[PDB]
């Protein structure tokens, strides 16, 4: 009806059955080979895990349960005054495989608003963190400290059937998603507003809107930005560091809190979630190296020299994406209908027309197209969100949606310990000989 | 004058060359397949990564740089009036591939003494944690917050050359290893000793003994147990959840504190490290519902009630080991020397004769044999460390040695971001149909 | 060293040496027991013969010199415009144990093009055959009458050293393989194409392509099918009747023509190569009895009848396979690439999902899974190859590749007369009492 | 339709030289087309084979050939035209855009 748990309960047997038969008939099918190079190259090209909530096509980009981002923009419920998709409705889609109705989304906003609550020990810890503790470290530590609230951990300690793991993973994941904006906003306010009162949860407002209120922003357009941002950074299949971390840690039956916190330690990695910032610091420098205004000739020229110094243009390229990221596209659409005459945004666009043709001619790109992180920084900066070290925290809150939707499914489907076999160089040489 | 950083400096270029040559000749060589079953079954027997410090043979158990546990028990230096191997020396071995001298180990003990010091914010955080936040959570949280002290994070922001990454990891790894007993003991004292403050570092003591001093123990044989415990838990190849988590998070260039804290979130999972706590809960439960010395048919009953309830027997089974874990045997060796008659040990021994024939007949176990977690807890209990909820913290402290040894090498060898491909069931069903 | 014959000459001494040593070490090693039941039950389970070219694993399916069919589909050369592996490349693998280069396969295609010719006497024979003489009988007779061309036969008559048998066997085997499409296509055209002139070999075309031309087919897709079919039917270890027959007859130093023709008389048996046809007759009826559109429900119904009838679902089960046959799989993949909406295919596709689980409940079948013969006929019928009595001739042309590859090796390695001991029931009753 | 016409040649004119040339092109053109790439399908259509059949029976007037196609295609298009009206299919009237307009519409 409206209760998401009940809808999910109904789906799991079906999906259990679908997989049982699949594996019966096709369990022994070879889907891929493993080379020495792949073992050294971070499992690049390896089909390593089943992840249900989203799949990243090299060419077309991310699909959430089959739906492209444009399709989500159209089908997923919006706020009443709204153009952008609510993350509530995305989460529903990932969980159910089905586009929610307005009522179902309405229901979920209120579910989340009611679960939004921090215990004193976490509030205290955050309030006591020094200012030189990075926001992703505060988030990670705080979510870890939240596992004192874990239903799944408690229930497992008391013994419980394997068949029932998913129900308590569901309640914990719902609690954590609920609480995350409270943690993330306490960190912002503590760091960047001298500790002012994060403020209330409006039980009739959507999750993003309570978040932007708690951050201390009001522009409806910033709330619309946050709706889109939380929606599109939600999931990116199972192989990205943060998603994989959550899956790997979760497979040992660590609870959602621990699984998510580990994922945030992955997201905090420069090669993962700290790119949005690298981009902005690179854009910033660039506009102060060839002036604010720059013609397509002199910009093209900067890019070629950049590349000749043995240096890459940040926010371009990807591990798996082989074409323009639809997450970039949608941010660009937002930019050009909302802040087309922003200086920093003009540069980002100017690179959009010039950088792809370069890189191609250089050859060493594989993906000469932009990723999400090429665009996200300038948008946040435009609305007043100038504190760049905090940007990944927004990415984190978003990613909880995807990784926790899947965590619920992993445990419902009885996925086991993730535990591959390793080899040393010495050993791998010997194996090769024999 | 001994300096492990200088030995590393020599060794790294040699291994870089070798791996370059090896990949030159064998990079394209197939070393295995991927099946559907593997993808659904947590990558079981998929050869997913290179990990240098230790390798697990299914048949023979763990080797550390080629050396068995028995070999390490004989070859590795010891404390002067001691019999068990110093964990310092194992770390040396893991890092260099060379058995250390007495002098090298002495140096390492002194090095970890000197870098042992906690910042006041971490002190503050630990002192304020509630008694119902699980020790592993306190540990992970505290280690995440230590990342404020990370030299790697700091240097990476400033654009440090990739050729320098390993030196920074080394420095952070040495610091964290040095600090770890400090954190672990404060958690112990705070939870279980009303926050006594006895806990200093003697600069002429080895790491294990300084640890047991801070825990408030005096028995020489507890210190020897601790030395062995920390040595044997140190590393178990790269495909275990904690090692793999560390590897994954560190491949994103997260610093050693973040990589270790995520590792601990994985180690805290019931199907991983937390099993050493769960074993003693399960033992306590069976003793309450039995005598202290039950018949073999009554043990079979208790085990059967566990298995028919959709629960696992803690400490039994393994993803890769296909016989008894040598870390189990070696702990058996210690008990039979030092506490052969202890009642809980007779039970543990008792279960060895019973549990494996069950499990085989239950069918849901490729391996019916015990792992290290089946045996650790009873040794601790004997010496008065009855706090079962603390047991995984000791495991965590030990497992730092292995994962950080490798992390140094991962960075030294330029291993890239770990990013496998995932598929959905729907996506997989279509891939097998084309 | 480029000629196949020279590569082969170089490999032979190594292998003689390797077997000599093995037999020296382990000749008297007992590898199996012989029961009374096995003697009455056609050597079922008995490890009777050394056959180098291919090994059938009960669970995994056939391997050609170590390589799975999926691997052969990836590794063996294709026609320049092609997807499916060339039977040339497979023969090369069987003979040398090595995956050929592209040029090697090219060479072999030209090699078989030059050797492809029939003596007048065999053409008269085929042209004089009546339409009621089954195609397999016409094939066997023609190949037997080709032995007038046997180099080996005449060389043996003039006297030749044991060491030299293989060279002549090679030349006869290459000649026979080249000739077989000419024979097979003359049969087809005489029976079903009103003796139309079969036409010329094109020396730049591969073997299968000249075959489908001479049959009077043009669809490149039928050529691809034919390439795949002749590759996967090539060999199935040595204990299948056709392979065993070739081996046993060959062990008397009967020439390859005699050896192969005898193998075709075995392949013509209903319990061997005539199975493709029974499947197709059965399905045809089934589509008539349950209509050309049927429900999983009503089909599963129809299966349970045919078992309670006492009859077996054709194309399911096998003497040694205990899982789905990879030869079935690869025909499945081809269908759902090239003709997924053929009614007859979709029925076969429905059987794949239902019959497996049904054969299991009934309990009687050791192997509940389909074998190659379940799939082959619907494919041939789809491309217009509707003369069901001819199907086994395609199988025969394929299987020549495997049995002749082994025949060369059997003579190279000096395998002697196959000559087991028999007993009567009377004598076996006596033997057991003693 | 190409294969079907090949069938008819090999039954009734298997040795005609032009049929032979069409048949040799089959072995050659698909590989060249794939190499140039360009076309997603290097395989022949019905029009590759139709004319060499006509030529054989003496209809050498190649500029007439599309008239036979025209006469045939009446059967399909009028069979559907009946049905389009039986079913009340309305005016076919898609929307068009200019490049300018499409550049804008992608930016809004």
PDB file of N, CA, C and O in Angstrom, chain A residues 37-85:
ATOM      1  N   UNK A  37      47.550  -8.760 -15.478  1.00  0.00           N
ATOM      2  CA  UNK A  37      47.495  -7.308 -15.544  1.00  0.00           C
ATOM      3  C   UNK A  37      46.322  -6.764 -14.728  1.00  0.00           C
ATOM      4  O   UNK A  37      46.443  -5.720 -14.089  1.00  0.00           O
ATOM      5  N   UNK A  38      45.212  -7.498 -14.740  1.00  0.00           N
ATOM      6  CA  UNK A  38      43.999  -7.102 -14.044  1.00  0.00           C
ATOM      7  C   UNK A  38      44.218  -7.201 -12.541  1.00  0.00           C
ATOM      8  O   UNK A  38      43.723  -6.367 -11.792  1.00  0.00           O
ATOM      9  N   UNK A  39      44.915  -8.266 -12.125  1.00  0.00           N
ATOM     10  CA  UNK A  39      45.254  -8.490 -10.730  1.00  0.00           C
ATOM     11  C   UNK A  39      46.128  -7.362 -10.211  1.00  0.00           C
ATOM     12  O   UNK A  39      45.962  -6.911  -9.072  1.00  0.00           O
ATOM     13  N   UNK A  40      47.043  -6.866 -11.055  1.00  0.00           N
ATOM     14  CA  UNK A  40      47.866  -5.720 -10.700  1.00  0.00           C
ATOM     15  C   UNK A  40      47.099  -4.403 -10.853  1.00  0.00           C
ATOM     16  O   UNK A  40      47.363  -3.457 -10.135  1.00  0.00           O
ATOM     17  N   UNK A  41      46.122  -4.347 -11.764  1.00  0.00           N
ATOM     18  CA  UNK A  41      45.499  -3.093 -12.173  1.00  0.00           C
ATOM     19  C   UNK A  41      44.172  -2.816 -11.452  1.00  0.00           C
ATOM     20  O   UNK A  41      43.315  -2.135 -11.999  1.00  0.00           O
ATOM     21  N   UNK A  42      44.000  -3.350 -10.234  1.00  0.00           N
ATOM     22  CA  UNK A  42      42.836  -3.012  -9.416  1.00  0.00           C
ATOM     23  C   UNK A  42      41.526  -3.580  -9.954  1.00  0.00           C
ATOM     24  O   UNK A  42      40.495  -2.901  -9.959  1.00  0.00           O
ATOM     25  N   UNK A  43      41.601  -4.833 -10.403  1.00  0.00           N
ATOM     26  CA  UNK A  43      40.472  -5.578 -10.927  1.00  0.00           C
ATOM     27  C   UNK A  43      39.774  -4.827 -12.056  1.00  0.00           C
ATOM     28  O   UNK A  43      38.585  -5.032 -12.261  1.00  0.00           O
ATOM     29  N   UNK A  44      40.518  -4.040 -12.830  1.00  0.00           N
ATOM     30  CA  UNK A  44      39.953  -3.244 -13.915  1.00  0.00           C
ATOM     31  C   UNK A  44      39.456  -4.212 -14.984  1.00  0.00           C
ATOM     32  O   UNK A  44      40.182  -5.112 -15.369  1.00  0.00           O
ATOM     33  N   UNK A  45      38.189  -4.083 -15.377  1.00  0.00           N
ATOM     34  CA  UNK A  45      37.604  -4.987 -16.355  1.00  0.00           C
ATOM     35  C   UNK A  45      37.055  -6.289 -15.765  1.00  0.00           C
ATOM     36  O   UNK A  45      36.475  -7.077 -16.496  1.00  0.00           O
ATOM     37  N   UNK A  46      37.206  -6.526 -14.459  1.00  0.00           N
ATOM     38  CA  UNK A  46      36.747  -7.781 -13.877  1.00  0.00           C
ATOM     39  C   UNK A  46      35.268  -7.664 -13.508  1.00  0.00           C
ATOM     40  O   UNK A  46      34.879  -6.724 -12.823  1.00  0.00           O
ATOM     41  N   UNK A  47      34.448  -8.637 -13.913  1.00  0.00           N
ATOM     42  CA  UNK A  47      33.080  -8.715 -13.412  1.00  0.00           C
ATOM     43  C   UNK A  47      33.102  -9.409 -12.049  1.00  0.00           C
ATOM     44  O   UNK A  47      33.199 -10.639 -11.943  1.00  0.00           O
ATOM     45  N   UNK A  48      33.017  -8.604 -10.984  1.00  0.00           N
ATOM     46  CA  UNK A  48      33.378  -9.090  -9.663  1.00  0.00           C
ATOM     47  C   UNK A  48      32.204  -9.287  -8.706  1.00  0.00           C
ATOM     48  O   UNK A  48      32.321 -10.077  -7.773  1.00  0.00           O
ATOM     49  N   UNK A  49      31.116  -8.522  -8.855  1.00  0.00           N
ATOM     50  CA  UNK A  49      30.050  -8.612  -7.869  1.00  0.00           C
ATOM     51  C   UNK A  49      28.701  -8.335  -8.509  1.00  0.00           C
ATOM     52  O   UNK A  49      28.624  -7.680  -9.541  1.00  0.00           O
ATOM     53  N   UNK A  50      27.645  -8.905  -7.908  1.00  0.00           N
ATOM     54  CA  UNK A  50      26.289  -8.565  -8.285  1.00  0.00           C
ATOM     55  C   UNK A  50      25.845  -7.403  -7.403  1.00  0.00           C
ATOM     56  O   UNK A  50      25.987  -7.448  -6.184  1.00  0.00           O
ATOM     57  N   UNK A  51      25.324  -6.370  -8.052  1.00  0.00           N
ATOM     58  CA  UNK A  51      24.835  -5.167  -7.404  1.00  0.00           C
ATOM     59  C   UNK A  51      23.564  -4.799  -8.154  1.00  0.00           C
ATOM     60  O   UNK A  51      23.611  -4.712  -9.373  1.00  0.00           O
ATOM     61  N   UNK A  52      22.421  -4.707  -7.443  1.00  0.00           N
ATOM     62  CA  UNK A  52      21.124  -4.772  -8.103  1.00  0.00           C
ATOM     63  C   UNK A  52      20.593  -3.367  -8.389  1.00  0.00           C
ATOM     64  O   UNK A  52      19.802  -3.160  -9.292  1.00  0.00           O
ATOM     65  N   UNK A  53      20.933  -2.415  -7.536  1.00  0.00           N
ATOM     66  CA  UNK A  53      20.217  -1.155  -7.522  1.00  0.00           C
ATOM     67  C   UNK A  53      20.519  -0.310  -8.759  1.00  0.00           C
ATOM     68  O   UNK A  53      19.642   0.401  -9.232  1.00  0.00           O
ATOM     69  N   UNK A  54      21.772  -0.290  -9.216  1.00  0.00           N
ATOM     70  CA  UNK A  54      22.126   0.431 -10.436  1.00  0.00           C
ATOM     71  C   UNK A  54      23.220  -0.298 -11.208  1.00  0.00           C
ATOM     72  O   UNK A  54      23.992  -1.101 -10.653  1.00  0.00           O
ATOM     73  N   UNK A  55      23.234  -0.018 -12.515  1.00  0.00           N
ATOM     74  CA  UNK A  55      24.220  -0.517 -13.460  1.00  0.00           C
ATOM     75  C   UNK A  55      24.726   0.634 -14.329  1.00  0.00           C
ATOM     76  O   UNK A  55      23.922   1.383 -14.888  1.00  0.00           O
ATOM     77  N   UNK A  56      26.063   0.737 -14.435  1.00  0.00           N
ATOM     78  CA  UNK A  56      26.756   1.737 -15.231  1.00  0.00           C
ATOM     79  C   UNK A  56      27.165   1.144 -16.573  1.00  0.00           C
ATOM     80  O   UNK A  56      28.081   0.305 -16.650  1.00  0.00           O
ATOM     81  N   UNK A  57      26.477   1.593 -17.620  1.00  0.00           N
ATOM     82  CA  UNK A  57      26.855   1.251 -18.977  1.00  0.00           C
ATOM     83  C   UNK A  57      28.038   2.126 -19.392  1.00  0.00           C
ATOM     84  O   UNK A  57      27.993   3.338 -19.242  1.00  0.00           O
ATOM     85  N   UNK A  58      29.137   1.567 -19.950  1.00  0.00           N
ATOM     86  CA  UNK A  58      30.260   2.397 -20.393  1.00  0.00           C
ATOM     87  C   UNK A  58      29.862   3.597 -21.252  1.00  0.00           C
ATOM     88  O   UNK A  58      30.407   4.691 -21.097  1.00  0.00           O
ATOM     89  N   UNK A  59      28.902   3.373 -22.152  1.00  0.00           N
ATOM     90  CA  UNK A  59      28.582   4.338 -23.190  1.00  0.00           C
ATOM     91  C   UNK A  59      27.509   5.311 -22.707  1.00  0.00           C
ATOM     92  O   UNK A  59      27.639   6.510 -22.948  1.00  0.00           O
ATOM     93  N   UNK A  60      26.455   4.803 -22.040  1.00  0.00           N
ATOM     94  CA  UNK A  60      25.251   5.588 -21.770  1.00  0.00           C
ATOM     95  C   UNK A  60      25.186   6.086 -20.322  1.00  0.00           C
ATOM     96  O   UNK A  60      24.324   6.890 -19.987  1.00  0.00           O
ATOM     97  N   UNK A  61      26.064   5.604 -19.439  1.00  0.00           N
ATOM     98  CA  UNK A  61      26.051   6.072 -18.058  1.00  0.00           C
ATOM     99  C   UNK A  61      25.019   5.342 -17.193  1.00  0.00           C
ATOM    100  O   UNK A  61      24.474   4.300 -17.560  1.00  0.00           O
ATOM    101  N   UNK A  62      24.744   5.918 -16.023  1.00  0.00           N
ATOM    102  CA  UNK A  62      24.136   5.177 -14.937  1.00  0.00           C
ATOM    103  C   UNK A  62      22.642   5.000 -15.192  1.00  0.00           C
ATOM    104  O   UNK A  62      21.974   5.923 -15.657  1.00  0.00           O
ATOM    105  N   UNK A  63      22.146   3.788 -14.902  1.00  0.00           N
ATOM    106  CA  UNK A  63      20.723   3.492 -14.854  1.00  0.00           C
ATOM    107  C   UNK A  63      20.373   3.031 -13.447  1.00  0.00           C
ATOM    108  O   UNK A  63      21.062   2.195 -12.892  1.00  0.00           O
ATOM    109  N   UNK A  64      19.346   3.663 -12.881  1.00  0.00           N
ATOM    110  CA  UNK A  64      18.805   3.286 -11.588  1.00  0.00           C
ATOM    111  C   UNK A  64      17.591   2.400 -11.804  1.00  0.00           C
ATOM    112  O   UNK A  64      16.539   2.928 -12.200  1.00  0.00           O
ATOM    113  N   UNK A  65      17.770   1.085 -11.540  1.00  0.00           N
ATOM    114  CA  UNK A  65      16.779   0.036 -11.764  1.00  0.00           C
ATOM    115  C   UNK A  65      16.219   0.123 -13.190  1.00  0.00           C
ATOM    116  O   UNK A  65      15.017  -0.057 -13.440  1.00  0.00           O
ATOM    117  N   UNK A  66      17.110   0.355 -14.163  1.00  0.00           N
ATOM    118  CA  UNK A  66      16.672   0.369 -15.553  1.00  0.00           C
ATOM    119  C   UNK A  66      16.462   1.785 -16.090  1.00  0.00           C
ATOM    120  O   UNK A  66      16.540   2.002 -17.305  1.00  0.00           O
ATOM    121  N   UNK A  67      16.244   2.753 -15.192  1.00  0.00           N
ATOM    122  CA  UNK A  67      15.863   4.097 -15.601  1.00  0.00           C
ATOM    123  C   UNK A  67      17.097   4.998 -15.670  1.00  0.00           C
ATOM    124  O   UNK A  67      17.867   5.101 -14.713  1.00  0.00           O
ATOM    125  N   UNK A  68      17.269   5.663 -16.824  1.00  0.00           N
ATOM    126  CA  UNK A  68      18.270   6.704 -16.987  1.00  0.00           C
ATOM    127  C   UNK A  68      17.919   7.904 -16.100  1.00  0.00           C
ATOM    128  O   UNK A  68      16.794   8.045 -15.615  1.00  0.00           O
ATOM    129  N   UNK A  69      18.881   8.798 -15.887  1.00  0.00           N
ATOM    130  CA  UNK A  69      18.614   9.977 -15.084  1.00  0.00           C
ATOM    131  C   UNK A  69      17.513  10.843 -15.709  1.00  0.00           C
ATOM    132  O   UNK A  69      16.600  11.270 -15.006  1.00  0.00           O
ATOM    133  N   UNK A  70      17.567  11.187 -17.016  1.00  0.00           N
ATOM    134  CA  UNK A  70      16.462  11.914 -17.646  1.00  0.00           C
ATOM    135  C   UNK A  70      15.066  11.338 -17.390  1.00  0.00           C
ATOM    136  O   UNK A  70      14.146  12.092 -17.077  1.00  0.00           O
ATOM    137  N   UNK A  71      14.922  10.009 -17.506  1.00  0.00           N
ATOM    138  CA  UNK A  71      13.675   9.318 -17.186  1.00  0.00           C
ATOM    139  C   UNK A  71      13.282   9.560 -15.723  1.00  0.00           C
ATOM    140  O   UNK A  71      12.106   9.721 -15.407  1.00  0.00           O
ATOM    141  N   UNK A  72      14.259   9.545 -14.809  1.00  0.00           N
ATOM    142  CA  UNK A  72      13.988   9.817 -13.405  1.00  0.00           C
ATOM    143  C   UNK A  72      13.526  11.260 -13.191  1.00  0.00           C
ATOM    144  O   UNK A  72      12.659  11.538 -12.365  1.00  0.00           O
ATOM    145  N   UNK A  73      14.152  12.186 -13.908  1.00  0.00           N
ATOM    146  CA  UNK A  73      13.784  13.583 -13.805  1.00  0.00           C
ATOM    147  C   UNK A  73      12.301  13.738 -14.138  1.00  0.00           C
ATOM    148  O   UNK A  73      11.615  14.508 -13.470  1.00  0.00           O
ATOM    149  N   UNK A  74      11.808  12.965 -15.110  1.00  0.00           N
ATOM    150  CA  UNK A  74      10.425  13.099 -15.551  1.00  0.00           C
ATOM    151  C   UNK A  74       9.464  12.312 -14.648  1.00  0.00           C
ATOM    152  O   UNK A  74       8.432  12.856 -14.249  1.00  0.00           O
ATOM    153  N   UNK A  75       9.798  11.048 -14.307  1.00  0.00           N
ATOM    154  CA  UNK A  75       8.851  10.141 -13.654  1.00  0.00           C
ATOM    155  C   UNK A  75       8.830  10.330 -12.137  1.00  0.00           C
ATOM    156  O   UNK A  75       7.782  10.167 -11.516  1.00  0.00           O
ATOM    157  N   UNK A  76       9.993  10.570 -11.510  1.00  0.00           N
ATOM    158  CA  UNK A  76      10.053  10.555 -10.053  1.00  0.00           C
ATOM    159  C   UNK A  76       9.305  11.768  -9.524  1.00  0.00           C
ATOM    160  O   UNK A  76       9.496  12.869 -10.050  1.00  0.00           O
ATOM    161  N   UNK A  77       8.446  11.611  -8.484  1.00  0.00           N
ATOM    162  CA  UNK A  77       7.777  12.755  -7.870  1.00  0.00           C
ATOM    163  C   UNK A  77       8.706  13.918  -7.522  1.00  0.00           C
ATOM    164  O   UNK A  77       9.877  13.736  -7.173  1.00  0.00           O
ATOM    165  N   UNK A  78       8.155  15.134  -7.646  1.00  0.00           N
ATOM    166  CA  UNK A  78       8.871  16.348  -7.295  1.00  0.00           C
ATOM    167  C   UNK A  78       8.200  16.933  -6.062  1.00  0.00           C
ATOM    168  O   UNK A  78       7.102  16.505  -5.732  1.00  0.00           O
ATOM    169  N   UNK A  79       8.834  17.911  -5.400  1.00  0.00           N
ATOM    170  CA  UNK A  79       8.139  18.721  -4.405  1.00  0.00           C
ATOM    171  C   UNK A  79       7.015  19.481  -5.112  1.00  0.00           C
ATOM    172  O   UNK A  79       7.058  19.611  -6.329  1.00  0.00           O
ATOM    173  N   UNK A  80       5.986  19.935  -4.383  1.00  0.00           N
ATOM    174  CA  UNK A  80       4.870  20.621  -5.033  1.00  0.00           C
ATOM    175  C   UNK A  80       5.356  21.815  -5.860  1.00  0.00           C
ATOM    176  O   UNK A  80       4.951  21.987  -7.007  1.00  0.00           O
ATOM    177  N   UNK A  81       6.237  22.640  -5.292  1.00  0.00           N
ATOM    178  CA  UNK A  81       6.699  23.813  -6.019  1.00  0.00           C
ATOM    179  C   UNK A  81       7.882  23.539  -6.953  1.00  0.00           C
ATOM    180  O   UNK A  81       8.684  24.441  -7.189  1.00  0.00           O
ATOM    181  N   UNK A  82       7.974  22.313  -7.499  1.00  0.00           N
ATOM    182  CA  UNK A  82       9.274  21.732  -7.798  1.00  0.00           C
ATOM    183  C   UNK A  82       9.435  21.200  -9.220  1.00  0.00           C
ATOM    184  O   UNK A  82       8.504  20.681  -9.820  1.00  0.00           O
ATOM    185  N   UNK A  83      10.675  21.284  -9.716  1.00  0.00           N
ATOM    186  CA  UNK A  83      11.038  20.709 -10.997  1.00  0.00           C
ATOM    187  C   UNK A  83      11.944  19.490 -10.809  1.00  0.00           C
ATOM    188  O   UNK A  83      11.929  18.600 -11.647  1.00  0.00           O
ATOM    189  N   UNK A  84      12.700  19.427  -9.707  1.00  0.00           N
ATOM    190  CA  UNK A  84      13.737  18.411  -9.567  1.00  0.00           C
ATOM    191  C   UNK A  84      13.188  17.175  -8.835  1.00  0.00           C
ATOM    192  O   UNK A  84      12.312  17.294  -7.983  1.00  0.00           O
ATOM    193  N   UNK A  85      13.697  15.951  -9.136  1.00  0.00           N
ATOM    194  CA  UNK A  85      13.292  14.724  -8.438  1.00  0.00           C
ATOM    195  C   UNK A  85      13.733  14.656  -6.977  1.00  0.00           C
ATOM    196  O   UNK A  85      14.883  14.956  -6.648  1.00  0.00           O
TER     197      UNK A  85
END
